[PDB]
Amino acid sequence: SKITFPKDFIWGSATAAYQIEGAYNEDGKGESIWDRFSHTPGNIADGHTGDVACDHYHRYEEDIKIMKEIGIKSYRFSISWPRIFPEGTGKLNQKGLDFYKRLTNLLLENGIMPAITLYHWDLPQKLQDKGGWKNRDTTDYFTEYSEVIFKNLGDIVPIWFTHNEPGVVSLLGHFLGIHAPGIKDLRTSLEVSHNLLLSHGKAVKLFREMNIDAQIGIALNLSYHYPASEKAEDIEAAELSFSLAGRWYLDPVLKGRYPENALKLYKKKGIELSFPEDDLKLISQPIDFIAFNNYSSEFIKYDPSSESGFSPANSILEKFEKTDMGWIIYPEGLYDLLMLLDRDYGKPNIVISENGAAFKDEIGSNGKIEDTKRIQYLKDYLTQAHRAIQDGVNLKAYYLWSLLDNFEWAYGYNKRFGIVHVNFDTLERKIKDSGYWYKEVIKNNGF
């Protein structure tokens, strides 16, 4: 029987610029680090690139029509810094800015609330040539970019996110090197994590200084990390796991410190950090909500052989349903994560900035996409979200990742997360059943 969400609850859908826009070298847009990373064989599945993607730069009018028909209340998208400042600083590319001005106006005219992410991973390559996020100057350039954006859009865009998933940019982009810019250095990765947090602080401070009449936050990748067993060493391994992945970004932002057990670990590996203590005060500027991207959960065991003292519990993992990513399905995970946030960070306002899943989608001979595995996933995860609202969590919005099938970073176009199907040869859009379903969910404020 039917569940119903709070009355003001915001039903949304999300994208990112490099994943959908294409037009990678049009209207003076500067090269980003993802253009550079995508142009190198071996980096992306099948040699895919974001050169064209869903061509949303040209087709946004069609895409807005689709949103209005599904009935989403908020549309989360990101702005491409290299379209605004091709060289990352210097002179302003008005054609790029007009794109977003127009986009935002068309959303508001169709009754859709904009939610903007300022950085979703596309640093201008010119700034990467001078060290990128390892160079503290990038945090000032980011603020200059944010200023232009706040000046033109601030008051008419009710939801802002400084950054998407600084932890991924950090680990995958500067440690593992499987994301742009493909650097492999532990220490570099930690300087980067810090400069990303700094840049967030500076933009929040700027936002208040310009007295923008809207809510700002940050979107972190979060996942509940469960201990493999009740044994003490497993409890500690999971908490260490969560500290390195989640508390490393939550604690600076919401409590003005780094987690101690993670600093311990990195000390053991030869790395101590000297942060101006005034930086942590910048980083913990008050924000109006905390947001996170969640898909799955982790299971973690003590592991002395590992570089980090822990590793995944593959035994346990082998026993759940998996998505097309190889990720476990475990809806209770979202409840536990929501409760953790509520309990450990003083009952903050919470946005789910992303949630979704990827399954092999086929268009049937009937011309439709009957993606019932995705509908089941969404049903299941949303039931757990609802449960957590009941138990007193302040969850205000849910953004379904993704509106459109898109360039999924290192996996290219092989992994579909959309509620709208995209044929990447013809660029035609077909609303999937998950989309039709979501339409009804929104109508009814639940299911």
Swiss-Prot record:
It catalyses: Hydrolysis of terminal, non-reducing beta-D-glucosyl residues with release of beta-D-glucose. One of its GO terms (cellular component) is cytosol. It comes from the Bacteria. Gene3D superfamilies: Glycosidases (3.20.20.80). Disulfide bonds: none annotated. The active site is at 165 (proton donor), 354 (nucleophile). Pathway: Glycan metabolism; cellulose degradation. Belongs to the glycosyl hydrolase 1 family. InterPro entries: Glyco_hydro_1 (IPR001360), Glyco_hydro_1_AS (IPR018120), Glyco_hydro_1_beta-glucosidase (IPR017736), Glyco_hydro_1_N_CS (IPR033132), Glycoside_hydrolase_SF (IPR017853). SUPFAM superfamilies: (Trans)glycosidases (SSF51445). One of its GO terms (molecular function) is beta-glucosidase activity. Its EC number is 3.2.1.21. GO terms for biological process: cellulose catabolic process. It is an enzyme of class 3 (hydrolase). This is Beta-glucosidase A. Pfam families: Glyco_hydro_1. Keywords: Carbohydrate metabolism, Cellulose degradation, Glycosidase, Hydrolase, Polysaccharide degradation.
